[PDB]
Design a protein around this nucleic acid. Structure first.
Ligand SMILES: [Tl+]
Ligand SMILES: [Tl+]
Ligand SMILES: [Tl+]
Ligand SMILES: [Tl+]
Ligand SMILES: [Tl+]
Ligand SMILES: [Tl+]
Ligand SMILES: [Tl+]
Ligand SMILES: [Tl+]
Ligand SMILES: [Tl+]
Ligand SMILES: [Tl+]
Ligand SMILES: [Tl+]
Ligand SMILES: [Tl+]
Ligand SMILES: [Tl+]
Ligand SMILES: [Tl+]
Ligand SMILES: [Tl+]
Length: 95
RNA sequence: UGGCCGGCAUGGUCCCAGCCUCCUCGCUGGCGCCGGCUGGGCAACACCAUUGCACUCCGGUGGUGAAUGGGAC
Protein backbone atom coordinates (compact mmCIF):
# COMPACT_ATOMS: atom_id res chain seq x y z
CA UNK A 1 0.00 0.00 0.00
CA UNK A 2 2.85 2.37 0.94
CA UNK A 3 3.76 5.01 -1.66
CA UNK A 4 7.10 5.93 -3.22
CA UNK A 5 8.77 9.33 -2.51
CA UNK A 6 7.24 12.25 -4.36
CA UNK A 7 7.58 16.01 -4.75
CA UNK A 8 4.03 16.21 -3.43
CA UNK A 9 2.92 15.26 0.04
CA UNK A 10 -0.65 14.18 0.57
CA UNK A 11 -2.09 15.44 3.84
CA UNK A 12 -5.39 14.25 5.18
CA UNK A 13 -7.30 14.28 8.52
CA UNK A 14 -7.46 18.08 8.18
CA UNK A 15 -10.14 20.11 10.00
CA UNK A 16 -12.90 20.32 7.37
CA UNK A 17 -14.49 23.51 8.80
CA UNK A 18 -11.65 25.68 7.41
CA UNK A 19 -12.27 27.65 4.21
CA UNK A 20 -10.04 26.83 1.26
CA UNK A 21 -8.22 30.15 1.04
CA UNK A 22 -7.41 30.06 4.76
CA UNK A 23 -6.35 26.40 4.82
CA UNK A 24 -3.89 27.04 1.96
CA UNK A 25 -2.45 30.11 3.69
CA UNK A 26 -2.11 28.26 7.00
CA UNK A 27 -0.42 25.25 5.37
CA UNK A 28 2.06 27.51 3.65
CA UNK A 29 2.76 29.12 7.01
CA UNK A 30 4.07 25.90 8.54
CA UNK A 31 5.37 23.94 5.52
CA UNK A 32 7.26 26.69 3.65
CA UNK A 33 10.41 26.27 5.76
CA UNK A 34 11.03 22.82 4.32
CA UNK A 35 11.83 24.24 0.89
CA UNK A 36 10.20 26.15 -1.97
CA UNK A 37 6.51 25.25 -2.47
CA UNK A 38 5.16 25.34 -6.03
CA UNK A 39 1.53 25.08 -4.99
CA UNK A 40 -0.95 23.76 -2.49
CA UNK A 41 -4.11 22.08 -3.77
CA UNK A 42 -7.26 21.97 -1.68
CA UNK A 43 -10.88 21.29 -2.54
CA UNK A 44 -13.96 21.15 -0.34
CA UNK A 45 -15.89 18.65 -2.50
CA UNK A 46 -17.40 15.65 -0.69
CA UNK A 47 -14.67 13.41 -2.07
CA UNK A 48 -11.76 15.77 -1.42
CA UNK A 49 -12.45 17.67 1.83
CA UNK A 50 -10.07 17.30 4.78
CA UNK A 51 -7.21 16.63 2.35
CA UNK A 52 -4.48 18.70 0.67
CA UNK A 53 -1.62 18.41 -1.77
CA UNK A 54 1.48 20.42 -0.91
CA UNK A 55 3.70 20.48 -3.95
CA UNK A 56 7.39 20.92 -3.17
CA UNK A 57 9.99 21.77 -5.79
CA UNK A 58 12.39 19.23 -4.38
CA UNK A 59 11.69 15.75 -3.02
CA UNK A 60 14.07 16.39 -0.13
CA UNK A 61 11.75 19.14 1.15
CA UNK A 62 8.70 16.85 0.91
CA UNK A 63 10.57 14.01 2.65
CA UNK A 64 11.62 16.40 5.40
CA UNK A 65 8.07 17.76 5.81
CA UNK A 66 6.58 14.27 5.93
CA UNK A 67 8.75 13.08 8.83
CA UNK A 68 8.89 16.43 10.65
CA UNK A 69 5.15 17.23 10.64
CA UNK A 70 3.62 13.76 10.90
CA UNK A 71 0.71 14.03 13.32
CA UNK A 72 1.24 17.77 13.90
CA UNK A 73 -1.79 19.40 15.67
CA UNK A 74 -3.36 21.73 13.10
CA UNK A 75 -6.73 23.36 13.71
CA UNK A 76 -7.02 20.88 16.60
CA UNK A 77 -6.49 17.71 14.54
CA UNK A 78 -3.38 15.49 14.17
CA UNK A 79 -2.28 15.99 10.59
CA UNK A 80 -1.65 12.67 8.76
CA UNK A 81 0.92 12.85 5.96
CA UNK A 82 2.15 10.54 3.17
CA UNK A 83 3.62 11.01 -0.30
CA UNK A 84 0.98 11.45 -3.04
CA UNK A 85 0.46 8.35 -5.23
CA UNK A 86 1.49 10.18 -8.41
CA UNK A 87 3.11 13.40 -9.60
CA UNK A 88 1.21 16.68 -9.70
CA UNK A 89 0.72 18.11 -13.20
CA UNK A 90 2.94 21.03 -12.14
CA UNK A 91 5.74 18.58 -11.55
CA UNK A 92 5.12 16.85 -14.90
CA UNK A 93 5.02 20.16 -16.78
CA UNK A 94 8.54 20.72 -15.49
CA UNK A 95 10.30 17.46 -14.79
C1' U B 1 -43.57 37.33 0.74
C1' G B 2 -37.56 35.05 -2.14
C1' G B 3 -42.61 34.78 -5.44
C1' C B 4 -48.65 34.44 -4.34
C1' C B 5 -53.43 34.13 -2.41
C1' G B 6 -57.34 33.75 1.65
C1' G B 7 -59.49 34.86 6.63
C1' C B 8 -59.29 37.97 10.74
C1' A B 9 -57.84 42.21 13.47
C1' U B 10 -56.15 47.31 12.77
C1' G B 11 -57.76 55.46 12.66
C1' G B 12 -53.41 58.67 10.04
C1' U B 13 -48.62 60.53 9.63
C1' C B 14 -43.91 61.17 11.01
C1' C B 15 -39.42 60.98 14.99
C1' C B 16 -36.20 58.04 18.43
C1' A B 17 -34.60 53.36 20.27
C1' G B 18 -34.32 48.17 20.32
C1' C B 19 -34.76 43.96 17.68
C1' C B 20 -35.20 40.59 13.18
C1' U B 21 -33.48 38.15 8.49
C1' C B 22 -30.72 31.75 3.39
C1' C B 23 -32.72 34.83 -1.44
C1' U B 24 -31.78 43.36 -2.33
C1' C B 25 -28.72 43.42 6.85
C1' G B 26 -30.59 48.66 6.36
C1' C B 27 -32.65 53.89 8.27
C1' U B 28 -37.17 56.33 1.37
C1' G B 29 -36.03 47.01 4.76
C1' G B 30 -39.48 44.70 8.43
C1' C B 31 -41.02 43.89 13.54
C1' G B 32 -50.85 42.65 14.66
C1' C B 33 -53.06 37.33 14.14
C1' C B 34 -54.17 32.41 11.25
C1' G B 35 -53.88 29.38 7.36
C1' G B 36 -52.66 27.70 2.43
C1' C B 37 -49.58 27.19 -2.84
C1' U B 38 -45.04 27.71 -4.57
C1' G B 39 -39.42 29.49 -7.39
C1' G B 40 -34.00 29.91 -6.63
C1' G B 41 -29.29 28.64 -4.07
C1' C B 42 -26.14 25.87 -1.08
C1' A B 43 -22.82 31.58 -1.24
C1' A B 44 -22.82 32.51 4.22
C1' C B 45 -24.64 30.18 8.69
C1' A B 46 -26.37 25.44 10.87
C1' C B 47 -26.92 20.43 10.77
C1' C B 48 -26.47 15.48 8.53
C1' A B 49 -23.21 12.28 5.97
C1' U B 50 -17.96 11.86 4.53
C1' U B 51 -10.76 9.79 6.71
C1' G B 52 -11.58 10.69 1.16
C1' C B 53 -5.04 10.56 -3.83
C1' A B 54 -6.49 15.26 -6.57
C1' C B 55 -4.58 18.39 -10.55
C1' U B 56 -12.63 20.21 -14.95
C1' C B 57 -16.59 24.11 -9.75
C1' C B 58 -19.77 20.20 -8.32
C1' G B 59 -23.00 15.50 -1.37
C1' G B 60 -27.73 16.34 1.31
C1' U B 61 -31.15 19.08 4.50
C1' G B 62 -32.58 23.63 7.32
C1' G B 63 -33.70 28.75 8.45
C1' U B 64 -38.96 34.75 7.20
C1' G B 65 -42.45 28.18 11.53
C1' A B 66 -38.25 36.14 12.14
C1' A B 67 -38.24 40.68 15.19
C1' U B 68 -40.94 45.56 20.23
C1' G B 69 -41.52 49.35 22.90
C1' G B 70 -41.51 54.51 23.63
C1' G B 71 -42.18 59.68 21.76
C1' A B 72 -44.63 63.82 18.63
C1' C B 73 -48.39 65.83 16.03
TL1 LIG C 1 -40.63 33.68 2.31
TL1 LIG D 1 -52.57 37.68 3.03
TL1 LIG E 1 -52.65 56.35 16.25
TL1 LIG F 1 -33.82 51.11 14.60
TL1 LIG G 1 -33.63 39.61 4.22
TL1 LIG H 1 -33.59 49.39 9.02
TL1 LIG I 1 -36.30 49.86 9.09
TL1 LIG J 1 -37.71 42.25 4.78
TL1 LIG K 1 -48.41 31.26 5.24
TL1 LIG L 1 -49.26 32.66 6.62
TL1 LIG M 1 -37.30 26.71 -2.31
TL1 LIG N 1 -20.04 25.30 -8.40
TL1 LIG O 1 -19.84 17.25 -12.84
TL1 LIG P 1 -23.20 20.69 1.37
TL1 LIG Q 1 -44.98 52.79 18.51
Amino acid sequence: PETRPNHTIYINNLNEKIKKDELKKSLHAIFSRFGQILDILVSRSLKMRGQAFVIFKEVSSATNALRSMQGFPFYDKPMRIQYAKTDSDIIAKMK
